[PDB]
């Protein structure tokens, strides 16, 4: 018997505020200059945002408008009052951005545990955090505020997901809300049960789930208030929830291998599982200084393969071009597509269509096998 | 298969931030062992921004934070605009205000004397040595910023070849890369480390050695760049070899389970391996809201156990007290010991004695088994 | 015919926010270490405060608490909501002050002024402007007009004929306020009644003709957001407001954020004190006193009086009496005015001179008897 | 006997670094968008610059380039090394300026001129600025290459019955390289290359400098400078920028403000009026006052104080100014041609009486008009 826990946070969590600002700046630059080199870090703490780093760009007007891009993103997140702890219209914004082959091993992962081919704990955690935001923004639960966190504990027996053990949903809200009479039943109804009905897991036993809504009580203020956040401090939330395997994504243009190769490996892994070649797979790519193409491409199927792993590797080599320039080309990465990736996970998204989540190589793999 | 891990010196801008965050933590703990600390650092060209939240009676230490920051930067070795950054003259801004569901992991493997995976162990040995030869004046033209990368070739899980070593280091502008830097780094850093390690079977006879493959490296640190606390988690832990339960360490007092429980799991795993109970082990601890002690303690021995895994788990239960208060007590964590952890890895350190690296539970485990 | 205009601002004006923060930090340090050396500058802009400079102090706890001192001062000013443009509880605060523990004079010319135009011996335009800005704040803080918000500005224009103040020409009062307030039906009459008319009754000028004053309340209209919002402020940017409203010459240098060892501050204070006592002693109707210092000498090398023809005693005799009665060595000024005390935050708005609401050492008429007996 | 002291500082003084950054930003914006609204404040302290305020502008490329403009200004000032206390290439720069695209005041302002110097400025400030400019010049031209940017000058003149009789004291404090012997090298070099050359330039017909007390770095070594261990802000040298304390000020700093700010353009216009009045021979010295009212473009008052030195009835002088000058703010901006990138040079060495650059408000182009109108 094993327990596995993963978590997700809303776009209002102070670390995720930074990821989104970083990727909003990236997007704004790429929209006007697809060739922009961007490495932009964001810090938030009580009442202030500090955006720093380096860019090379011809998008001078977009660069000039970064301060406005910052405020607009914070307002979109929903921080529009001191009463909520943070206000995009009135907060401090300081900008300190300058403007004028490698050895590596990267991993990607997929598993037939959910429709989106993600491990169950992180998949359910992201579905819950996204729904928590949706019910606030659509006016379903209009007393909600932006900050929030979800945690999912699944009980396993011999690698089989048998029970939904614990779900924790913590959300910011207006001060006059009764936690027991209002928040608890509303969250259970509009967020948890709605998500569980969506997922429609064929075998998971949710009959005795321990559900904890705001277990630490009132959550009136949030975000940077009495706290701090930074870009790239939610890597495990951004990826596989600790289920599978460095370098953060947000604020980096796709020339950063930490981002584009991680994306490429997810794409490969997902297409391999969807091709029915394995129930679960970790794909590793090894790069060497002075070689564009990988020097190694390895598959681990954990005994779940339906073909010899060496043939899976051969098929991947034939179907995918894992040179960095080819990855960027094939995944059409030189576009302002990054702000949405900055909360609710980079992998297994059910609400937006991302290039590295497309099952557009399934038939190619099958034919190549 | 090929496996690569990386380490960076204390001069890398992200590591400057980790060190500043933990230097502030240490200063507060030295005067008030019960301090609550969550301190994040940002660096970019010519400036440091330290933010977060503290609860402390160490008001004198809090007041002296700006001086603690400058002293740390000078110790790192940034003491001139010619090097790209100067602790004595740079900008310093301070904006610090003044259970849970969880799964944490720890890992150990009999691949090195320090019981760490070989790629990260060698990368950290190399980065420490690179700093050592600079500070003691052996190679006096070296400057603080640097990076090491180690690629090991494996055949059926046996480390058979040292495939590639990359050492990149900052240096004075007048240095001949081929006549001076290359042989000096080979002799004083790489070869001494290899001789120190004295691996009984690893073949180093055809290692590809690259010293500053991208050429001159004169300016470094935050210059024309940016760093943040907690952006080198893979370097801080197992180099990608073993999974992380998520969460950065630096700037956080021991009450933060992300830090202390990760340390505890390393401690458990290392003692299990040292006790000969397995060649390699991942230990997992599961916590539930409302319970002090873990609701789960799981061992994965990858087929390398010398006793039944359930018996190992039983022994760990008897020997270790994994309540948060007990971990803090048993590892004597309420002390100023953290600044040294902020570069060269938190795990597997040879150069400093860390409580979670002690083999002080080996005999207890052997008797309990 | 002549017109003279001076202005004042409330403690909510963004430059005045900075002056108050700077002197609030000064006061906190002096309270625990009276010998603290302090040169603290404050910047504000949308949503953020930046406090910078250098301090030498043993008041380490006070130094650690500076961020709390900053937030408390902003809340006292009245900025407690994003709806007002600024919130002390939730705004950004960054501290970049160099700090150390402890352990000749300059060439200078400093000026002080006084004039029998008002009870507080200040020029009429600045005196009235300060009384108005102070009353504006008062009626907000005491709940008389609770819809007011912190930021505000007053302007007073006086018409003179042959140097006599004959007419109150124009009064401008601009004030921040809640969004729903009717400018013509509520704000205008409330401000006239509770601010302008009360101040005029307080002053009770025996001869000034206020019968045709042009009164303008919020001439530009709605004033809902204020302070640093969509603006910026810095310490030391309201020097004319802080002193004589342009009526009298300045020897340069701002006051706030500076401990009393800064001659720009303490000597300007000493010269006011001298001028005020000279006028109160009946020695002149108006006077500018100038002190000259030389490097290497503590005591002044020159002490000059300009009475603009209004003296009742030979100016040389006035200078002689000042020389006997006053000790204008910087060290003596500090000791005699008892300046090493947390007394500065109140000076940071509504003027450093002529204050009718607080007792300041350099405003004390405690040297009149000495001058009369010395002459 | 009376003593009057004024001071000036070099472009390297931390407050002047701020004024220059603020006006360099203004210039860059005006160059591409002459209608830009600019209110830009600069702060400096150890190792960092913070530029804040608000701009309305179409000059988006110039706005994007503000950080580079800041660094280039600091480098031109001469701060290029941690060894000097500050380096424009490596220092921190943060920009907190609000930015948008385009979509009456009660006042009394003063201007002043006096026939005490060729530039029609009071002698103490005129000499102080001449000295601070020459101090910078001998560093930049390599005459005294060991000098560094920061410095300050003070001039004390002794007066007898309003006549400047003696140069009493000169204080020159300057940043310098660490190895320099203050007493044996700096002191005589400064006496020779800075003070004596300035006195030769001025060639004052009566001022007796024979026993001037000269103090070079009286407080000792000055190796580090600028923001190092200090702080500066825009608009904190108002008396240096204007008349050195000799003449009254109707409030408000100049730098970082576009010409629509009456604090700047009206102060400039008043200097212009006053200078032309003296140069027209209508008085030896004059303070001109302009009064403005809310809701009227043209002044509601224009007054002259000639301090008994007039050669024509003060009321006639006031009438002549009324005919010759259009003191509506829009007219001032048009007639002085203010919507141009001309402001960075004004940010050190004084806005008035400049002998090294040509400023519109220093031109004697209304002298003939005044004589015809009088
Ligand atoms: Na003499």
Going from N- to C-terminal start, the domains of chain B cover 1-7+118-219, 8-98+220-256, 99-117+257-369
Query: Is any Cβ of chain D less than 8 angstroms from the Cβ of B80?
Result: yes
Report the separation in Å between the CA atom of C291 and the middle of ligand 1, taken as the mean of its atom positions. Answer: 19
Phi/psi region, residue C193 (left: phi>0; alpha: psi -120 to 50; beta: rest), is alpha
Which residues have CB under 8 Å from C366's CB, separation 6+?
Answer: C277
Say whether B366 is catalytic: no
C-alpha Rg value of chain B to the nearest Å:
21
Could you tell me if C13 and C20 are in contact, meaning their C-beta atoms sit under 8 angstroms apart?
no
Element (H, E) at C131: helix C124-141
Q: Where are the beta strands (DSSP E) in C27-115?
A: 37-45, 48-56, 80-81, 86-87, 92-100, 108-115
Could you tell me if D262 and D283 are in contact, meaning their C-beta atoms sit under 8 angstroms apart?
no
Query: Is any Cβ of chain B less than 8 angstroms from the Cβ of A92?
Result: no
**Complete DSSP assignment for D9-25:** E-TTSHHHHHHHHHHHH
Q: Tell me the three state secondary structure of residue B127.
A: helix
Structure-solving method: X-ray
Distance separating alpha carbons of residues D113 and D247, to the nearest angstrom = 9
**CA separation (Å) from D63 to A90, B67, D96, D249?**
21, 35, 12, 32
Apex D248 CA angle, D244 and D251, nearest 5: 95
C-alpha dihedral sign at B251, B253, B256, B259 = positive
Q: What is the CATH number of domain C103-123+263-375?
A: 3.30.300.10
Query: Is any Cβ of chain D less than 8 angstroms from the Cβ of C108?
Result: yes
Could you tell me if B258 and A73 are in contact, meaning their C-beta atoms sit under 8 angstroms apart?
no
Distance separating alpha carbons of residues A82 and A88, to the nearest angstrom = 10
Eight-state DSSP code of residue C11: T
Which among A342, A304, A317 has a CA at the least distance from the CA of A110? Answer: A304
Contact D249 C241 (CB under 8 A): no
Q: What is the CATH number of domain A9-100+222-256?
A: 3.30.300.10
What residues of D are in contact with residue A61 (Cβ under 8 Å)? Answer: 60-61, 64
CATH topology of domain D102-122+262-374: GMP Synthetase; Chain A, domain 3 (3.30.300)
What is the signed CA dihedral for C180, C183, C186, C187, rounded to 10 degrees? 100
Resolution, expressed in angstroms to one decimal: 1.9
With b for 16 or more beta-carbon neighbours within 10 A and e for fewer, the C193-230 pattern comes to ebbbebbbeebebeebeeeebeebbbeeeebebbbbbb
Which among A125, A148, A359 has a CA at the least distance from the CA of A236? Answer: A125
Q: Which residues pair with B234 in a beta bridge?
A: none
Distance separating alpha carbons of residues D128 and C224, to the nearest angstrom = 46
CB-defined contacts A:D, below 8 A: 41
**CA separation (Å) from B157 to B154, B201, B348?**
6, 13, 21
Say whether C83 is catalytic: no
Phi and psi at C107, nearest 5°, equal -75, 130
Find the length of chain B.
Answer: 369
Report the separation in Å between the CA atom of D213 and the middle of ligand 1, taken as the mean of its atom positions. Answer: 6
Q: Tell me the three state secondary structure of residue C9.
A: strand
Distance separating alpha carbons of residues B17 and A230, to the nearest angstrom = 12
A92-99 and A48-56 strand pairing: parallel
Phi/psi region, residue D277 (left: phi>0; alpha: psi -120 to 50; beta: rest), is alpha
Say whether A16 is catalytic: yes
Contact B85 D83 (CB under 8 A): no
Could you tell me if D95 and D49 are in contact, meaning their C-beta atoms sit under 8 angstroms apart?
no
Residue B362's CB: how many other CB atoms inside 10 A?
18
Q: What is the CATH number of domain B8-98+220-256?
A: 3.30.300.10
C-alpha Rg value of chain A to the nearest Å:
21
In the numeric block, which tokens belong to residue D338?
Answer: 């203010």
- Of these residues, A4, A63, A107, A219, which one is catalytic? A219
CA atoms within 13 A on the CB side of A214: 20
Say whether A41 is catalytic: yes
Report the separation in Å between the CA atom of D221 and the middle of ligand 1, taken as the mean of its atom positions. Answer: 25
Distance separating alpha carbons of residues C319 and C302, to the nearest angstrom = 10
What residues of C are in contact with residue B62 (Cβ under 8 Å)? Answer: 64
Say whether B225 is catalytic: yes
C-alpha Rg value of chain D to the nearest Å:
21
Could you tell me if A38 and A55 are in contact, meaning their C-beta atoms sit under 8 angstroms apart?
yes
- Of these residues, C99, C232, C294, C332, which one is catalytic? C232
Question: Chains with ≥3 Cβ pairs under 8 A against C?
Answer: A, B, D
Could you tell me if B91 and D91 are in contact, meaning their C-beta atoms sit under 8 angstroms apart?
yes
Distance separating alpha carbons of residues D181 and D193, to the nearest angstrom = 16
Query: Is any Cβ of chain C less than 8 angstroms from the Cβ of A79?
Result: no
Query: Is any Cβ of chain B less than 8 angstroms from the Cβ of C90?
Result: no
In the numeric block, which tokens belong to residue C77?
Answer: 């000013």
Query: Is any Cβ of chain C less than 8 angstroms from the Cβ of B187?
Result: no
B53 is in an annotated binding site: yes
Apex D75 CA angle, D69 and D79, nearest 5: 135
Distance separating alpha carbons of residues C111 and C244, to the nearest angstrom = 11
Could you tell me if A94 and A51 are in contact, meaning their C-beta atoms sit under 8 angstroms apart?
yes
In the numeric block, which tokens belong to residue D29?
Answer: 């914006």
Phi and psi at A53, nearest 5°, equal 135, -150
Which among B82, B114, B106, B90 has a CA at the least distance from the CA of B16? Answer: B90
CATH 3.30.300.10 matches C1-8+124-225: yes
Could you tell me if A282 and A299 are in contact, meaning their C-beta atoms sit under 8 angstroms apart?
yes
Distance separating alpha carbons of residues C250 and C239, to the nearest angstrom = 9
Backbone break loci in chain A, preceding residues, C–N > 2.5 A: 100, 245
Could you tell me if A233 and A17 are in contact, meaning their C-beta atoms sit under 8 angstroms apart?
no
Which among C134, C222, C234, C208 has a CA at the least distance from the CA of C179? Answer: C222
Q: What is the CATH number of domain C9-102+226-262?
A: 3.30.300.10
Distance separating alpha carbons of residues A81 and C84, to the nearest angstrom = 11
Distance separating alpha carbons of residues A3 and B105, to the nearest angstrom = 13
Say whether C59 is catalytic: no
Q: How far apart are the first and last CA of chain B?
A: 35
Report the separation in Å between the CA atom of D166 and the middle of ligand 1, taken as the mean of its atom positions. Answer: 7
In the numeric block, which tokens belong to residue B15?
Answer: 């590591």
Burial (CB count within 10 angstroms: exposed 0-12, middle 13-18, buried 19+), residue A220: middle
Give the minimum alpha-carbon distance from C28 to chain B in angstroms, rounded to a whole number: 14
Residue D62's CB: how many other CB atoms inside 10 A?
23
Among D residues 220-249, those touching chain B with beta carbons less than 8 Å apart: 228
Tell how far CA D60 is from the center of its chain.
Answer: 29
Which among A240, A237, A241 has a CA at the least distance from the CA of A250? Answer: A237
Distance separating alpha carbons of residues D290 and D293, to the nearest angstrom = 10
Which among B301, B236, B278 has a CA at the least distance from the CA of B110? Answer: B278
Q: Where are the beta strands (DSSP E) in chain B?
A: 2-8, 36-44, 47-55, 79-80, 85-86, 91-97, 102-109, 142-155, 158-171, 208-211, 226-228, 280-287, 296-300
Q: Where are the beta strands (DSSP E) in A216-343?
A: 228-230, 280-287, 296-300
Distance separating alpha carbons of residues C350 and C241, to the nearest angstrom = 8
Residue B157's CB: how many other CB atoms inside 10 A?
11
C-alpha dihedral sign at C222, C87, C238, D28 = negative
**CA separation (Å) from C177 to B90, C78, C131, C152, C223?**
42, 12, 20, 9, 6
Tell how far CA C88 is from the center of its chain.
Answer: 23
Could you tell me if D132 and D316 are in contact, meaning their C-beta atoms sit under 8 angstroms apart?
no
Query: Is any Cβ of chain C less than 8 angstroms from the Cβ of D23?
Result: no
Q: What is the CATH number of domain B99-117+257-369?
A: 3.30.300.10
**CA separation (Å) from B242 to B104, C313, D108, D373?**
12, 93, 74, 92
Query: Is any Cβ of chain B less than 8 angstroms from the Cβ of A209?
Result: no
Say whether A206 is catalytic: no
Q: Tell me the three state secondary structure of residue C147.
A: coil
Eight-state DSSP code of residue A157: E
Distance separating alpha carbons of residues B136 and D249, to the nearest angstrom = 61
With b for 16 or more beta-carbon neighbours within 10 A and e for fewer, the A299-325 pattern comes to bbbeeebebeeeebeebbeebbebebe
Give the minimum alpha-carbon distance from C128 to chain D in angstroms, rounded to a whole number: 15
Give the minimum alpha-carbon distance from B30 to chain A in angstroms, rounded to a whole number: 23
Phi/psi region, residue A307 (left: phi>0; alpha: psi -120 to 50; beta: rest), is beta
In the numeric block, which tokens belong to residue B120?
Answer: 């990260």
What residues of D are in contact with residue C230 (Cβ under 8 Å)? Answer: 54, 98
Could you tell me if C133 and C152 are in contact, meaning their C-beta atoms sit under 8 angstroms apart?
yes
- What is the architecture of the domain spanning A1-8+120-221? 2-Layer Sandwich (3.30)
Q: Tell me the three state secondary structure of residue D335.
A: helix
Say whether A361 is catalytic: no
In the numeric block, which tokens belong to residue A178?
Answer: 């009764």
B1-7+118-219 CATH pick, 3.30.300.10, 3.40.50.300, 1.25.40.10, 3.40.50.720: 3.30.300.10
Contact C97 B64 (CB under 8 A): no
Helix, strand counts (H, E) of chain B = 11, 13
One fold for A1-8+120-221 and A9-100+222-256: yes
Element (H, E) at A86: strand A86-87
Query: Is any Cβ of chain B less than 8 angstroms from the Cβ of C96?
Result: yes
Phi and psi at D98, nearest 5°, equal -70, 140
Place of tokens 């290039």: A355
Distance separating alpha carbons of residues C324 and C321, to the nearest angstrom = 5
CB-defined contacts A:B, below 8 A: 136
- Of these residues, A126, A136, A234, A266, which one is catalytic? A234
Place of tokens 């926010």: C17
**CA separation (Å) from D184 to B18, B122, D43, D179?**
49, 59, 37, 12
Distance separating alpha carbons of residues B80 and D47, to the nearest angstrom = 12
Place of tokens 């004929």: C161
In the numeric block, which tokens belong to residue D27?
Answer: 């210039």
Q: Tell me the three state secondary structure of residue C166.
A: strand
In the numeric block, which tokens belong to residue C317?
Answer: 């005799």
For D95, the closest of A61, A95, A100 (CB atoms) is A95
Which among D273, D288, D280, D286 has a CA at the least distance from the CA of D368? Answer: D280
Distance separating alpha carbons of residues A168 and B288, to the nearest angstrom = 11
Helices D14-32 & D66-77 angle (0-180, nearest 10): 130
Tell how far CA B186 is from the center of its chain.
Answer: 24
Could you tell me if D25 and D66 are in contact, meaning their C-beta atoms sit under 8 angstroms apart?
yes
- Of these residues, A11, A19, A33, A41, which one is catalytic? A41
Closest-CA residue of chain B to D88? B46
Query: Is any Cβ of chain B less than 8 angstroms from the Cβ of C280?
Result: no
Q: Which residues pair with C152 in a beta bridge?
A: C175
Backbone break loci in chain C, preceding residues, C–N > 2.5 A: 103
Could you tell me if D80 and D13 are in contact, meaning their C-beta atoms sit under 8 angstroms apart?
no
Q: Tell me the three state secondary structure of residue A254.
A: coil
Place of tokens 């391996």: B273
What residues of D are in contact with residue B44 (Cβ under 8 Å)? Answer: 92
Phi/psi region, residue C307 (left: phi>0; alpha: psi -120 to 50; beta: rest), is alpha
Distance separating alpha carbons of residues B123 and B121, to the nearest angstrom = 6
Q: Where are the beta strands (DSSP E) in D60-162?
A: 80-81, 86-87, 92-100, 107-114, 147-160
Distance separating alpha carbons of residues A84 and A144, to the nearest angstrom = 10
Q: Tell me the three state secondary structure of residue B121.
A: helix
Protein residues placing their CB within 5 Å of the ion ligand 1: D 211
Residue set of the binding site of C for L-methionine:
54, 100, 231, 262
- Of these residues, C4, C86, C111, C223, which one is catalytic? C223
Closest-CA residue of chain A to B250? A233
Give the minimum alpha-carbon distance from B4 to chain A in angstroms, rounded to a whole number: 6
Closest-CA residue of chain B to D94? B47
CATH 3.30.300.10 matches D9-101+225-261: yes
Phi and psi at B205, nearest 5°, equal -70, -25
CATH 3.40.390.10 matches D1-8+123-224: no
Residue D34's CB: how many other CB atoms inside 10 A?
15
Distance separating alpha carbons of residues D246 and C249, to the nearest angstrom = 7
Could you tell me if A109 and A245 are in contact, meaning their C-beta atoms sit under 8 angstroms apart?
yes
CATH topology of domain A101-119+257-369: GMP Synthetase; Chain A, domain 3 (3.30.300)
Distance separating alpha carbons of residues B300 and B285, to the nearest angstrom = 12
């Amino acid at each position: 018997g094993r327990l596995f826990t993963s978590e997700s946070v809303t776009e209002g969590h102070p670390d995720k505020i930074c990821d989104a600002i970083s990727d909003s700046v990236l997007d704004a630059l790429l929209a006007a200059d697809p060739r922009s080199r961007v490495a932009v870090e964001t810090l938030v703490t009580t009442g202030q945002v500090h955006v720093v780093g380096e860019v090379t760009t011809s998008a001078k007007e977009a660069f000039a408008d970064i301060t406005n891009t910052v405020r607009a993103r914070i307002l979109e997140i929903g921080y529009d009052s001191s009463d909520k702890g943070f206000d995009g219209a009135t907060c401090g914004v300081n900008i300190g951005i300058g403007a004028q082959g490698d050895q590596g091993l990267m991993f990607g992962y997929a598993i037939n545990a959910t429709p989106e081919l993600m491990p169950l704990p992180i998949a359910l955690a992201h579905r819950l955090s996204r729904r928590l935001t949706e019910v606030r923004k659509n006016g379903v639960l209009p007393y909600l505020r932006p900050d929030g966190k979800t945690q999912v504990t699944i009980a396993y027996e011999d690698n089989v997901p048998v029970r939904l053990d614990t779900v924790v949903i913590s959300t910011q809200h207006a001060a006059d809300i009764d936690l027991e009479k209002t928040l608890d039943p509303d969250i259970r109804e509009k967020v948890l049960n709605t998500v569980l009905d969506d997922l429609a897991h064929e075998t998971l036993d949710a009959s005795t789930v321990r559900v904890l809504v705001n277990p630490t009580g009132k959550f009136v203020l949030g975000g940077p208030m009495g706290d701090a956040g930074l870009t790239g401090r939610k890597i495990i939330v951004d990826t596989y929830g600790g289920w599978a395997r460095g370098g953060a994504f947000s604020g980096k243009d796709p020339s950063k291998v930490d981002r584009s190769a991680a994306y490429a490996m997810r794409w490969v892994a997902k297409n391999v599982v969807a091709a029915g070649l394995a129930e679960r797979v970790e794909v590793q790519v090894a790069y060497a200084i002075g070689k564009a193409a990988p020097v190694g491409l390895f598959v681990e199927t954990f005994g779940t393969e339906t073909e010899d792993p060496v043939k899976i590797e051969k098929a991947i080599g034939e179907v995918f071009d894992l040179r960095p320039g080819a990855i960027i080309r094939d995944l059409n990465l030189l576009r302002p597509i990054y702000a949405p990736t900055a909360a609710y996970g980079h992998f297994g998204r059910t609400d937006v269509e991302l290039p590295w989540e497309q099952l557009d190589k399934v038939d190619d793999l099958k034919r190549a096998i």
